[PDB]
């Protein structure tokens, strides 16, 4: 299922546990950006997905502060887990930096990450 | 300034505690479409007038309903006399692969401390 | 009344547009933000026969941020709908992609939302 | 290197012309290419891109109305062209439907498309 170690297409490492209560907890390590070492993540997932072949909806957040760096920013990933022979988590993400009001129009980056259990 | 009750432009209510460790926890009640929410925020933001970056997730399942979907809000808290949490959001539904191209809605919500 | 006219967004940008009978949007865009100066060409499309059930009119347009004065090596697309009424409005979300190397492509695209009115706020 | 026919990951086709002035014009259609599936597209691209290895920024719009059907919606693609033997147009898109105000919160889908010169 969702619990395990995942890697995105750029080599980031997503170590997650899906708890009985719909909780996602774990750590995220980024290969890009103002990042170093592991960061805390928390999120939620549908603990009772449909039984018609649909994926499992989920999302999580990382605030880019730890004991070694603070980028004053946070990313959220929204997506779905798709089980099968090669399990996959397909996501789109929003990355918001803290800004002044005058710069808020350019505060948010958008992209897409796909995660598998094998390094790219 | 984050802990407390917040209201968006469409009648939803966002009840949150900002923990000392960077955790966001609380409940969300929606007027469109109570649920658990969790997320994270920058616990040491800049002190130069910049906002505080944050994000959170709600999976739309509780003891009464299940929409097989989840929303993430990404944004910043801005303090002052008219404090705001300004966000953009992504809402992904569980779909088949053939319907995955239309699985994700995008929008924006502004939250205030007064209805 | 209609899409054709001069519009302003919440940040002071000026959107001068003509909606042709064939579904074409043409005109100029002037930005109050970013690496921008003077007017830029825009082109886009809109639904020339919208639903009659109270729904808005879908549309979209693109500006590449190159003119005779500057070139930011970037382009914005706005996707949204025109809502008629006593205070006509075009509500949009936008994507702004800059030309980047492959190593920087992950951070090439900004996202936001602009609301346009025929009265300057 | 933009002018020509491009194919996305899900069986859609477009034939675009990139004009000297920055114009994108053409037709967006399905894999089969029957008339009911063809729509006008228009957009813009950076006609003087950087020469440091960066991609070429561009965008375009299709409103989903033709002489045969009307979905009351429009998609914009925003992205960059990357040349070479394995040329690509890498995009993210927004698809907005005309809605009432009460339904406007759910009017916009988001996704991503990658286009190649080979099916
Ligand atoms: C402005 O960006 C930053 O301040 C920053 C700092 C550290 C890491 C990241 C990062 C990693 C990552 C990823 O793996 N997938 C999607 C987004 C994303 O963003 C961003
Ligand atoms: C398939 O189910 C849904 O799409 C669904 C179900 C229940 C609630 C929501 C909901 C509430 C809400 C909000 O307040 N702000 C931004 C997004 C958003 O989405 C969505
Ligand atoms: C990275 O950004 C740029 O290179 C750049 C250059 C010139 C103008 C803009 C600009 C103006 C504008 C607007 O009015 N609404 C939404 C987006 C937006 O973007 C962006
Ligand atoms: C179903 O209702 C719609 O709004 C509609 C109708 C027809 C075609 C499309 C279409 C094709 C296409 C594509 O190739 N890439 C990204 C988006 C996208 O959207 C959407």
């Amino acid at each position: 299922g969702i619990t395990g170690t995942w890697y995105n297409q750029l080599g980031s490492t997503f170590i997650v546990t899906a708890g009985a209560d719909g909780a996602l907890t774990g750590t995220y390590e980024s290969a890009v950006g103002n990042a170093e070492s592991r960061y805390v993540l928390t999120g939620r997932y549908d603990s009772a997905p449909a039984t018609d072949g649909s994926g499992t909806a989920l999302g999580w957040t990382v605030a880019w502060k730890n004991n070694y760096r603070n980028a004053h920013s946070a990313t959220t990933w929204s997506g779905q887990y798709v089980g099968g022979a090669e399990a996959r988590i397909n996501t789109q993400w929003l990355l918001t930096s803290g800004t002044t009001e005058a710069n808020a129009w350019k505060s948010t980056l958008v992209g897409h990450d796909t995660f598998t259990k094998v390094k790219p």
Side-chain angles (χ1 to χ4, degrees), chain A residues 4 11 15 17 26 32-33 39 50 54 71 79 87-88:
Chain A
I15 301 175
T17 301
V32 300
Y39 298 79
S54 295
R88 193 167 287 270

Side-chain angles (χ1 to χ4, degrees), chain A residues 7-118:
Chain A
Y7 307 97
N8 78 2
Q9 72 287 349
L10 295 181
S12 300
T13 305
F14 172 44
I15 301 175
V16 68
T17 301
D21 64 338
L24 299 178
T25 60
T27 61
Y28 199 95
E29 313 164 52
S30 174
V32 300
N34 228 37
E36 182 188 5
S37 187
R38 299 188 165 172
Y39 298 79
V40 173
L41 69 94
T42 58
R44 303 287 296 166
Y45 77 106
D46 179 4
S47 57
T51 53
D52 59 4
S54 295
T56 300
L58 49 63
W60 71 94
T61 303
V62 171
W64 298 107
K65 172 182 174 295
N66 65 14
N67 289 341
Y68 312 107
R69 298 265 216 279
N70 190 353
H72 304 302
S73 63
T75 302
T76 61
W77 290 258
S78 179
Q80 56 182 316
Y81 160 85
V82 178
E86 187 186 359
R88 193 167 287 270
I89 301 176
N90 297 318
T91 72
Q92 298 185 83
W93 54 258
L94 296 172
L95 161 53
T96 303
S97 299
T99 70
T100 67
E101 196 64 49
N103 292 322
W105 70 274
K106 55 175 183 177
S107 65
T108 309
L109 293 160
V110 61
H112 47 100
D113 283 358
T114 185
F115 294 86
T116 69
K117 297 209 174 174
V118 163

